[PDB]
Amino acid sequence: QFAKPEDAVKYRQSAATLMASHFGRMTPVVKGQAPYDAAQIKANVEVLKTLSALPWAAFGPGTEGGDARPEIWSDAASFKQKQQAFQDNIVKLSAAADAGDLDKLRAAFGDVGASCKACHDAYRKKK
Amino acid sequence: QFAKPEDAVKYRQSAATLMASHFGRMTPVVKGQAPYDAAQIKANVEVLKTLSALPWAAFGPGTEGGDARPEIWSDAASFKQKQQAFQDNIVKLSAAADAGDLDKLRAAFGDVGASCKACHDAYRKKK
Ligand code: HEC
Ligand code: HEC
């Protein structure tokens, strides 16, 4: 869907921006600094689930740019493993949210964050 | 969910970027220049539906910035009417996609595009 590689870069960066907001806005809730409303979090995690499927199709070969490290394309299987494992972690977060289980939510939230970081550490250029 | 107004601006611009990609990527399909696969379009419109609900909460009072025109906040009811009417147009597009009806899809797609433009004309600053 991208006329030029720059369009893929802009897309995946915007998807990431939205993921960071929908993930990060739950930090106060999982810390107990903001109240836990199960329906609110269920709905937010459903947005995050949709968003968290979106970046990967925007790393389609030849879309080097931005802060993607080159290793994404040359090790396609390993990058796919990491995005699939991340989306798996999002499924666990969805299950916790859908159950209204705050303890499971906290644990799942931590695992998701670790998965974001693990991918960035391997595949995102430093600043 | 925004620490500063700049964060709301970045969010709503990124949401718009994704909406433009998910809407605009169907142009060749509605023109017949690309093939029509009903399942593909159904899934894409479901992404667009999720995305098209997201910008509005990121124009929460005092978030002047970016290319929002000031009129968004001082005429809250009129801006709300336009976003709700736009989301209505997205419901029509969803119905067409879910029905697998290409003629209804074309018509709905045009109405959605007109709704995007009508809001920009009133509420987005020129370049
Ligand atoms: C690999 C499987 C990733 C996972 C899992 C997550 N992210 Fe990511 N992210 C990844 C890459 C390769 C890039 C660089 C994209 C580019 O072309 O520049 C990013 C980028 C981000 C950013 C920065 C976006 C920008 O402003 O330019 C953010 C804020 C970000 N990613 C957030 C994020 C979160 C919150 C994640 C888990 C919920 C997450 N990413 C997972 C690769 C991967
Ligand atoms: C009002 C109810 C709007 C509707 C409906 C749509 N858009 Fe919009 N859009 C709106 C505003 C006020 C702004 C400016 C945001 C800011 O703070 O700068 C925008 C912006 C865009 C952009 C530019 C994003 C950027 O790169 O900075 C795009 C590409 C965009 N909008 C696309 C878009 C599409 C495709 C829409 C219908 C499917 C649509 N917008 C509707 C307000 C409104």
UniProtKB/Swiss-Prot annotation, chains A, B:
PTM note: Binds 1 heme c group covalently per subunit.
Predominant location category: periplasm
Residues passing through the membrane, by range: none
GO cellular component: periplasmic space
Single GO MF descriptor: heme binding
Keywords, in A-Z order: Electron transport, Heme, Iron, Metal-binding, Periplasm, Pyrrolidone carboxylic acid, Transport
Residues with Pyrrolidone carboxylic acid modification: 1
Superkingdom of origin: Bacteria
Binding site for heme c: 12-13, 67, 116, 119-120
Localisation per UniProt entry: Periplasm
Pfam families assigned: Cytochrom_C_2 (PF01322)
GO BP: electron transport chain
Quaternary state and interactors: Homodimer.
Function statement: Cytochrome c' is the most widely occurring bacterial c-type cytochrome. Cytochromes c' are high-spin proteins and the heme has no sixth ligand. Their exact function is not known.
Protein name: Cytochrome c'
